[model samples]
Target: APTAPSIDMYGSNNLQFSKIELAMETTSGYNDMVKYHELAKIKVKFNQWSGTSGDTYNVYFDGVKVATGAITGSQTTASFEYGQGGLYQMEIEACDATGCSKSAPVEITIADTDGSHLKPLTMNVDPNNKSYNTDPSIVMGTYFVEWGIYGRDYTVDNMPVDNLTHILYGFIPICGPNESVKSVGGNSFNALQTACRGVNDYEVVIHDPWAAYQKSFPQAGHEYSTPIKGNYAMLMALKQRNPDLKIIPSIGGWTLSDPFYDFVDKKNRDTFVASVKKFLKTWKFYDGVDIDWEFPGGGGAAADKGDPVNDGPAYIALMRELRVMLDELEAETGRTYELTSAIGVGYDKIEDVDYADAVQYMDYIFAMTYDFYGGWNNVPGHQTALYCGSFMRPGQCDGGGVDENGEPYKGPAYTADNGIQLLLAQGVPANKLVLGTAMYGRGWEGVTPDTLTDPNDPMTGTATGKLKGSTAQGVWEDGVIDYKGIKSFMLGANNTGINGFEYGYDAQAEAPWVWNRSTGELITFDDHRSVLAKGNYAKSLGLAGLFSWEIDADNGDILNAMHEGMAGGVVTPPNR
Candidate 1:
């Protein structure tokens, strides 16, 4: 039997038609096309068809034959027009001497003369113009780390609500009586232990009481009326001011994820779900919950935290139950709630959980595409490269090279493109996946050009000096510097080079890095250019949107760049 031909649809504001090959099936049940002005001209591209020479392609609208075209080459194009506006189902049939195979049906909706039933159009603008409108169709989200109040000094008031659609609170640890804990790289684990201590097990608890609600802000006015004072109060105020902004509490981070292993157990899954519901009800400002389990299986900050054999199936069950609980709350509150999660990018990490089953309960899945390479590894490489092993950079130096222990690297090509592709291949809908952006740069010291031997290019240079720790020099830590600190190092008006560090962009990698040859210090991070590139990449792929790890690390440039990239040009900031 001949394989079924794959079909895709594209739309335009003008009569000019383009071909978009949408491969993955959208779980939303519809592939939204661009809204047209008057006549809706539908263009379909036949991606794959295996049949005899005389085989013909048949186009069907609403299960009725509309048009037919002869297959000429490997890819065939056909178009039809709909004068009226209504919901329509499109399918393609490849008929040969034997039989016909039908492609998956695509659902499209056309607008009426009064513009009813019309979806928002995706507009593009020149990012260099420094003025653009936010793309309402795209999700522009950022993580507001709770710890930013201390060393970073970034408060909820500093949030750029005008440019954001969602703000996920960094972490809310799961408290349990028999909590199994392990120390990770940073202070995240220690903070988690402090938050979970003396608290009820199998429950979600705020990591810091003082910073979360007790600390007072100048704009908070009188804290007597409401208990919400610190970041929680400020977030509520911000949400009231911008009704569209969604504030979700993200549970489980790198260090705080120690309890997730126990939370997903069949014995305690419902207890954990109930705790999440209680947390949401008590903190009414939160629109939903974002499960940030470092990983379902092992390979997270604490290797012992996850059960490699059982974590995958248990995670799927946990999400399924959590969705039911969220729905029950919706019925009581008369409001919709979102269920989302932050997932690891590596292929192994993605496979650890049955994401195909798990994503059914999630509204969006944020792919942690950054942190491909960092100070943790002795080799200095691009932490957030869009592509790896380009022609100029041939080889898996991103994460495939030698390790600090002189062992062969054992990881997938760490790139935003690869990570997103892996998720898509796992039957995840493209519209539900959000590509991750890094607002901070990973740096290494004692990296010199001489260290770049045959295969060791600038990206994979060996750092002779030891890895810099938190005490080195940074906004919060040494080995990692915020985008704000990185912006200051840019030299000329064009941001070419300055402060003994020359800026370099890898065309293939679609990432930026700065090297201070004098000091032998190299930092790889996402700048305005790189962030915009990622935004464009996400837009082109019809992704959910773009999200950054730590928004406080940005100096307005990275966020704006993401907006411009997602919007397809410079945009004017929307009034709050």
Candidate 2:
């Protein structure tokens, strides 16, 4: 039997006795390519081709020293075990005592356990352009969407209709109009409304649209507020336009997240779900309600449904509402109002809830896998790591599982080993989960050229004139753009904020980030190569399928990789 060999993404670079430059490059996933549990391991052989005998050396992945040994020795090799997956940066220095410590850049790579075998799929690229493929519609799987026109964007005029399974719709409210929303999706409201009807994937974000209306006339009415009348209208509008779409009114906005006052409490859980059901009944075409509580009980804000004492209980109770009510609603109406929830990417959100309980009710949980590094922290990281970067590690340095003013740069610590594994351990069926990829970017300016020696480093930092486009607080503040705009800024204006890397074999972590510490700027965004990792991850998890925050973000080429990767990945993977 021929074994799949790991892909090597390295190049020899000259580093002086004391200089440091990103010598050998791995897949952008510095340490996020391979999936692991409590403990993970990687093989390495650090050789010294220097004129003088190699100095003492130590390798650190994400700042936690994993391997150490004296160089110049005939056998300078070792295997490293990671408490969690993160930036696998090797710090080769002279630890020969007598304060003779000179940090040499040790070349290290974490190969993707699946990169060697996974193939690329046809992603709906340049969705902002909205040109229909008109060919291979969709395969037997699931698809997700939000206000990014959950309508049918693919040209299925002649494709096989037999290749369809489940349809998903997510309704996320955006900060502003991107190239896709404007050019492809239609201008703002029209863009969103049109998307709801024309395309099949539909999710109605109950915010932003109201935000836009509010900005139009500050101190506006509850036009966008819930019991979600606007979402109701949109659903009706979606039906009026196409009458063939299925939608879910999931509530959560950027400004006010997880603010489900009536429904999130244990005592009020019944009332909350009832109100949602009522709203659904009033709205008509909805199949069920999707919960987008930024976090249950209380992540940080008092409004968080997660009750501190019994936060997990609070979340579990809410999901119970969906499951129990949907079952009742189905018996009553002869229609199954499927329960779905947009889950948090970092482990923190999942930490508060019982994943198995939630999975039981929900048809699928969309792993909100984006924003790994935004405003809160000023460090570059992979958007989605295979595991938590730090198991014993805690705090913002560990990926800020609760920072509101964030770019959500790290999902490994908060999500992978802890959050995601927590779900699996709790027995959340694999098909019930979907790995989500954001069709946008998270950026940080004023990133320090200062490198830390540990995971507990302080994260206060500054940035230059970063990719300035603000949804609020003006242009200097953190903002978001659609997919095509990202490409335009990246390729057209030469925006460095656009970054992504593939998780080729041995160097398995996959991410879209490139930082210039000297310039204090870091870019965290997704590209085709990085998206492949996500598709592969979904397959590795035996997930229902891959989901995108919005369809209008990528180069329209990402789908090529995704579809192919899913086709290539094994749904029934063997235990490693």
Name the top TM-score candidate. Answer: 1
lDDT by residue for model 2 over 1-576, one digit each (tens)?
011111122322121011111112122111121122333455444443443334465655446666666554533544445433222446534344333333444444332211111122112223223222312322222234333332323221111112223334344432222122332233554534432332212122232333211111111112222111222223333343333344555554332343343343454565455555544543345667666665664543333245645655666677776677677777876875667777665555666677755565567676676655455444445455443333123454445554545456354353333455667777877766667656666665555545433323212334443545643211223534554455554433343443331111213345544444444544555666666766667767676666565443444544445565576544431110
Candidate 1 residue lDDT tens string, 1-576: 345767655433222221221112111111121112335566677666464433688877699887787765657776676555545677888777888878898775543322123222122222322444876667889999887888777787677777788899987777653233444345544655565555556677666666775576665562332323567657766766676778899988776676678755566888788878866765666888999888888787774567767888887888888899999989987978899999888777887887888888888888898888877767767788888734223334444666446666665667777788778888888888888889888888888877765433466567864335442234355578877677675434467888788888888789888887777788888988888888888767778888998987776788888887876532222210
How many residue pairs clash in each candidate at the backbone level?
12, 75
RMSD of 2: 29.3
Error of 2 at 507 (Å): 4.2
Q: Tell me model 1's lDDT, rounded to 2 decimals.
A: 0.70
TM-score for candidate 2: 0.52
Cα RMSDs, all models: 21.9, 29.3
Worst 10 residues of 2 by lDDT: 15-24
